[PDB]
């Protein structure tokens, strides 16, 4: 569950936008227009900072060459024009094709550009050799709509053609390495997945289909239906685990890149979608339409943040891991529910996209989870400690001890950052839960096993969303999608049966005692002694105490319990915007 929060950053109404590009170091968005102009917008200030008058005909392709302080354009008049974006001077001009130029791809390490055209050719040009033609790629039998360089092998590139094919090429051969067929109508767009884990290509065609290809096996691995007309653009985001597709139906769709689940549909009322651009290390996405261009930020509805016992917060602003400390405030200055002043310091960019951040029980360590991976750091200066791959991670209550889950079947345990054991729960492992005991959710219900030997303690017929153990381990809360249960865990009864042998196929008989059930839906939660504090689905901030439900507050927005600092007698919460609020609790 990605739960993307999409916000508008820039809306630039204009004539038909054919291409968009984002600058790697300046906050700039380039747009090429059907009216022959190329505009540069600052997406922070929202100011039009540059205009180049290229020609009178459409400019279907425009790219930044940041290492050369250039803008490279390709127009319907078959010319490539190079502009210095500092001086605004046209540095060079040359006739590249015999029909409309459709696309430009800039080499990331060598002095080259690739251009594609309606003339059915792809050409390579060397800017260190006076823009001479280094290679002509022949094989397509219709317009070459789009080209893209392999980010993992810069000597390779892929092309999309209206001849219904995709061709994969190498720079020293004028003939294709191979040809991918499967599209029923012409191909408009082509992109590569950036990660090393999957040799994937993405295309979109006039058949209204998005196809996913394995270029090593030379096969179609997935077909995504949904768009009502021609898919004009399709990409894999470089940081986020998503696929972005645009169509002439006027919609932009966001799909999970592993599961292919439809995450969001955006209709900004700008008519047909023509182009998309993303940027490595940025959450900004540029979109081009008939009625102009927009920039959106792909944030999170649910924040990745964790607070330790002393109140030191570790969160993520996109892929940047930061540290936040509350500025000192008196009792006569803290008002319940009010946002609090914080001191924020960068700690470093994370190697994976952070979905969850969790400190271990003592706060000495912090784990970062993101799309099948995890990394553990020393919370002090975020120094790497261990890393690995997992569907789910769970800390133990005995700090510097954890468990990882593989698909829906394998559970592995670790002590002092080294594997100690591995096992397979009897009915599967849909989800794992940390704390005093290791929890496993299957299709059967819930089962608790012991951290020391993976021996079953109890099987309870329940489907939990959350499990929260009290600090002593004498109490547990099992929260479902409908209600929550408070149970007393009787460790003495377990220790006795562990020797004397009431032991069924569901574990120890009188191991747990149901103390109460509450018809409420728990969102976030924590224990303070024998009081279980939680945020409900109806935005209430409550607490359970000896069967009774006490209400602290009804919150303005979705809020997430961070921690409780006993010295301050204060409960802390955060929102999606990483603002920190508090409530006193005696």
Helix, strand or coil for residue 497? Answer: helix
What's the CA angle centered on 296, arms 202 and 578, to 5 degrees?
A: 115
In sequence order, what DSSP letters do the residues of 56-122 get, joined into one string? SS-EEEEEEEGGGTEEEEEETTSEEEEEETTT--EEEEEE--SS-EEEEEE-SSSSEEEEEETTS-E
At residue 190, φ and ψ (nearest 5 deg) are -150, 140
Asked if 190 and 147 touch (Cβ cutoff 8 Å), the reply is yes
At residue 566, φ and ψ (nearest 5 deg) are -55, -40
Asked if 192 and 212 touch (Cβ cutoff 8 Å), the reply is no
Q: Where are the alpha helices (DSSP H) in 259-343?
A: none
Helix, strand or coil for residue 491? Answer: helix
Query: How many angstroms separate the CA atoms of 338 and 579, rounded?
Result: 9
In sequence order, what DSSP letters do the residues of 511-522 get, joined into one string? SEEEEEEESS-E
Query: How many angstroms separate the CA atoms of 164 and 176, rounded?
Result: 15
Indicate left, alpha or beta for 280 from its phi (over 0: left) and psi (-120 to 50: alpha). beta
Asked if 270 and 291 touch (Cβ cutoff 8 Å), the reply is yes
Q: Is 91 exposed, middle or buried (0-12, 13-18, 19+ CB in 10 A)?
A: middle
**Which positions ≥6 away from 406 have C-beta within 8 Å?**
390, 391, 412
Locate 549 and state its tokens: 């439900």
- Look up tokens 């820039």; give the residue: 10
Query: How many angstroms separate the CA atoms of 19 and 165, rounded?
Result: 22
Secondary structure E strands in 150-261 = 156-161, 166-170, 178-180, 187-192, 200-205, 210-214, 219-224, 231-236, 242-247, 252-256
Query: How many angstroms separate the CA atoms of 115 and 297, rounded?
Result: 30
Resolution (A): 2.4
Query: How many angstroms separate the CA atoms of 222 and 201, rounded?
Result: 11
**DSSP assignment, residue 499?**
H
Locate 550 and state its tokens: 């006490």
Asked if 85 and 38 touch (Cβ cutoff 8 Å), the reply is no
Query: How many angstroms separate the CA atoms of 503 and 501, rounded?
Result: 6
Asked if 100 and 61 touch (Cβ cutoff 8 Å), the reply is no
**DSSP assignment, residue 128?**
G
Q: What is the CA radius of gyration of the chain?
A: 28
Helix, strand or coil for residue 531? Answer: strand
- Helix (H) or strand (E) run with residue 377 in it: strand 373-378
Query: How many angstroms separate the CA atoms of 304 and 292, rounded?
Result: 34
The beta-carbon contacts of 486-493 under 8 Å, at least 24 apart in sequence, are 486/514, 486/515, 486/516, 486/517, 486/518, 486/532, 486/544, 487/512, 487/513, 487/514, 487/515, 488/512, 488/513, 488/515, 489/436, 489/437
At residue 289, φ and ψ (nearest 5 deg) are -135, 175
Asked if 435 and 468 touch (Cβ cutoff 8 Å), the reply is yes
**DSSP assignment, residue 495?**
H
Helix, strand or coil for residue 115? Answer: strand
**Which positions ≥6 away from 333 have C-beta within 8 Å?**
none
How far is CA 275 from its chain centroid? 21
245-266 burial code (b ≥16 CB/10 A, e <16) = bbbbbbbbbbbbbeeeeebbeb
- Look up tokens 């439809």; give the residue: 262
Query: How many angstroms separate the CA atoms of 493 and 307, rounded?
Result: 34
**Which residue, 217, 144, 235, 131, is CA-closest to 180?**
217
Query: How many angstroms separate the CA atoms of 178 and 184, rounded?
Result: 18
Counts for the chain of helices (H) and strands (E), in that order: 1, 57
At residue 507, φ and ψ (nearest 5 deg) are 90, -150
Locate 541 and state its tokens: 């901030």
Asked if 532 and 486 touch (Cβ cutoff 8 Å), the reply is yes
Alpha-carbon distance values, 548 to 97, 516, 551, 579 (Å): 78, 9, 10, 30
Asked if 109 and 93 touch (Cβ cutoff 8 Å), the reply is no
Bridge partners, residue 223, by sequence: 211
Q: Where are the alpha helices (DSSP H) in 170-262?
A: none
Locate 509 and state its tokens: 């008989």
**Which residue, 202, 291, 313, 324, is CA-closest to 255?**
202
165-198 burial code (b ≥16 CB/10 A, e <16) = bbbbbebeeeebeeebebbeebbbbbbbbeeeee
Query: How many angstroms separate the CA atoms of 529 and 518, rounded?
Result: 19
Alpha-carbon distance values, 50 to 106, 289, 417 (Å): 21, 20, 53
Indicate left, alpha or beta for 385 from its phi (over 0: left) and psi (-120 to 50: alpha). alpha
Asked if 144 and 117 touch (Cβ cutoff 8 Å), the reply is yes
Asked if 512 and 488 touch (Cβ cutoff 8 Å), the reply is yes
Query: How many angstroms separate the CA atoms of 194 and 465, rounded?
Result: 33
Locate 528 and state its tokens: 């303070």
At residue 143, φ and ψ (nearest 5 deg) are -50, 135
**Which residue, 491, 487, 450, is CA-closest to 469?**
487
Query: How many angstroms separate the CA atoms of 247 and 266, rounded?
Result: 11
The experimental method, as deposited, was X-ray
Query: How many angstroms separate the CA atoms of 576 and 586, rounded?
Result: 27
End-to-end CA distance of the chain: 36
């Amino acid at each position: 569950p990605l739960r993307l929060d999409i916000k508008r950053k820039l809306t630039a109404r204009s004539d038909r936008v054919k291409s968009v590009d984002l600058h790697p170091t300046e906050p700039w968005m380039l747009a090429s227009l059907y009216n022959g102009s190329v505009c540069v917008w600052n997406h922070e200030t929202q100011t039009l900072v540059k205009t180049f008058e290229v020609c009178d005909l459409p400019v279907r392709a425009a790219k930044f060459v940041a290492r050369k302080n250039w803008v490279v354009t390709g127009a319907d008049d078959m010319q490539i024009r190079v502009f210095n974006y500092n001086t605004l001077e046209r540095v060079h001009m040359f006739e590249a094709h015999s029909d409309y130029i459709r696309c430009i791809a800039v080499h990331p390490t060598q002095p080259f550009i690739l251009t594609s055209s309606d003339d059915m050719l792809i050409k390579l040009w060397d800017w260190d050799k006076k823009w001479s033609c280094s290679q002509v790629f022949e094989g397509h039998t219709h317009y070459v709509m789009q080209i893209v360089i392999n980010p993992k092998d810069n000597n390779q590139f892929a092309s999309a053609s209206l001849d219904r094919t995709i061709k994969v090429w190498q720079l020293g051969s004028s003939s294709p390495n191979f040809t991918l067929e499967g599209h029923e109508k012409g191909v408009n767009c082509i992109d590569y997945y950036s990660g090393g884990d999957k040799p994937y290509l993405i295309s979109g065609a006039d058949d209204r289909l998005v196809k996913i290809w394995d270029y090593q096996n030379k096969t179609c691995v997935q077909t995504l239906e949904g768009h009502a007309q021609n898919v004009s653009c399709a990409s894999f985001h470089p940081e986020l685990p998503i696929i972005i597709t645009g169509s002439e139906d006027g919609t932009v769709r966001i799909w999970h890149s592993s599961t292919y689940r439809l995450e969001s549909t955006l209709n900004y009322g700008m008519e047909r979608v023509w182009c998309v651009a993303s940027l490595r290390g940025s959450n900004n996405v540029a979109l081009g339409y008939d009625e102009g261009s927009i920039i959106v930020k792909l944030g999170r509805e649910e924040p990745a943040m964790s607070m330790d016992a002393n109140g030191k917060i570790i969160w993520a602003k996109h892929s940047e891991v930061q540290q936040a400390n509350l500025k000192a405030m008196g009792d006569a200055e803290i008002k319940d529910g009010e946002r609090l002043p914080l001191a924020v310091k960068d700690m470093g960019s994370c190697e994976i996209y952070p979905q969850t951040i969790q400190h271990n029980p003592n706060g000495r360590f912090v784990v970062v989870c993101g799309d099948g991976e995890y990394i553990i750091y020393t919370a002090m200066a975020l120094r790497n400690k261990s890393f690995g791959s997992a569907q789910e991670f769970a800390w133990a209550h005995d700090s510097s001890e954890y468990a990882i889950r593989e698909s829906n079947s394998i559970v592995k345990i670790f002590k002092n950052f080294k594997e100690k054991k591995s096992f397979k729960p009897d009915f599967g492992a849909e989800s794992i839960y940390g704390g005093f005991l290791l929890g496993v959710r299957s299709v059967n219900g819930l089962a608790f096993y012991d951290w020391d030997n993976t021996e079953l303690i109890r099987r309870i017929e329940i489907q939990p969303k959350h499990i929260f153990w009290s600090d002593s381990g004498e109490l547990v809360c099992i929260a479902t999608e409908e209600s929550f249960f408070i149970l007393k865990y009787l460790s003495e009864k377990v220790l006795a049966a562990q020797e004397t042998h009431g032991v069924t196929e569901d574990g120890i008989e009188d191991a747990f005692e149901v103390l109460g059930e509450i018809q409420e839906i728990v969102k976030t939660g924590l224990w303070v002694g024998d009081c279980f504090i939680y945020t409900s689905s109806v935005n209430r901030l409550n607490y359970y105490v000896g069967g009774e439900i006490v209400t602290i507050a009804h919150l303005d927005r979705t809020m997430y319990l961070l921690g409780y600092i006993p010295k301050d007698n204060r409960l802390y919460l955060g929102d999606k915007e990483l603002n920190i609020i508090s409530y006193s609790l005696l």
